[PDB]
Design a protein around this ligand. Structure first.
Ligand SMILES: [Cl-]
Length: 274
């Protein structure tokens, strides 16, 4: 069947599922006043997990709520993913920053607290990830870094990047890609050395001006989805710059969503069964 894509983004008051082939929105779910969604994810079974700043929740495909976790006052729940083991990972910016692993019943499987030193929760992170050693990769806006945090909260490593790092995603070789937000680029980080292998910007790609480089989603075919979020550039609305691209392994845009009326601003994506 046609591929379907679960999407959401800051400044878009819906999450949606798009039929990739037709480019049609086939399902929406509303966000409330004050909510901000920078993370959506699907389970293999087709359930939908999202963060919304005031919390994170899991719903069925028909819209029934399974479970919800509220962020504490002034905190911002900005991470929400499904780990390879099938459990959910959610996290909130705050003091302390908090990561939870959660089962499909909404029970807490683990908890990690850490302090970033960054006063405004909004200036902390968006999408935290978990690496093969079981530590957490935390990209941070204010300080343009990625930190590696142990489950007890200990700082294990930092690398300095640029821009406003938004997310990380793993490649088959075990390296990761880090989306650098306002730097209009992403980088590849070597597993062993934790050093920058490659920096990719619009000059390395054919077919898209990169605005805020939000979630990156590696594909089995060597390709990549890039969420090209336009909320920081007043010039983006004057043009037809795609909200979402698929690039192939050579860096060419092979497919895109490009309709700022039809599609809201997208910062997060996950393939979904239907
Ligand atoms: Cl296209």
């Amino acid at each position: 069947s046609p591929q379907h894509l679960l999407v959401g983004g800051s400044g878009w008051n819906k999450i949606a599922i798009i039929n990739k082939d037709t480019k049609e929105i086939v399902w929406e779910y509303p966000l409330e006043k004050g909510w901000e969604c920078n993370s959506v994810a699907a389970t293999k079974a087709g359930e939908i997990l999202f963060s919304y700043s005031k919390g994170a929740k899991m719903i069925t495909r028909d819209g029934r709520e399974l479970w919800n976790i509220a962020a504490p006052a002034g905190c911002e729940m900005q991470t929400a993913r499904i780990l390879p083991d099938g459990n959910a990972l959610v996290a909130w910016c705050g003091h302390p920053s908090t990561i939870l692993e959660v089962n499909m019943k909404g029970e807490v499987l683990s908890k990690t607290e850490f302090e970033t030193g960054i006063e405004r929760p909004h200036a902390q992170f968006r999408q935290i990830n978990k690496n093969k050693k079981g530590n957490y990769l935390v990209p941070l806006f204010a300080t343009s870094e990625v930190r590696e945090i142990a489950p007890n909260g200990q700082l294990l490593n930092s690398v300095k990047l640029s821009g406003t790092p938004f997310s990380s995603a793993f490649l088959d070789n075990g390296d990761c890609l880090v989306a650098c937000g306002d730097a209009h680029c992403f980088v590849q980080l070597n597993l062993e050395s934790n050093r920058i292998v490659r920096r990719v910007n619009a000059n390395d790609i054919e077919g898209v001006q990169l605005f805020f480089v939000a979630q990156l989603f590696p594909l089995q075919n060597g390709g990549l989805y890039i969420c090209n979020w336009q909320g920081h550039d007043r010039e983006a609305g004057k043009g037809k710059h795609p909200q979402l691209v698929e690039i192939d392994s050579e860096g060419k845009v092979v497919w895109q969503l490009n309709d700022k009326v039809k599609f809201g601003m997208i910062s997060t994506i996950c393939p979904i069964r239907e």
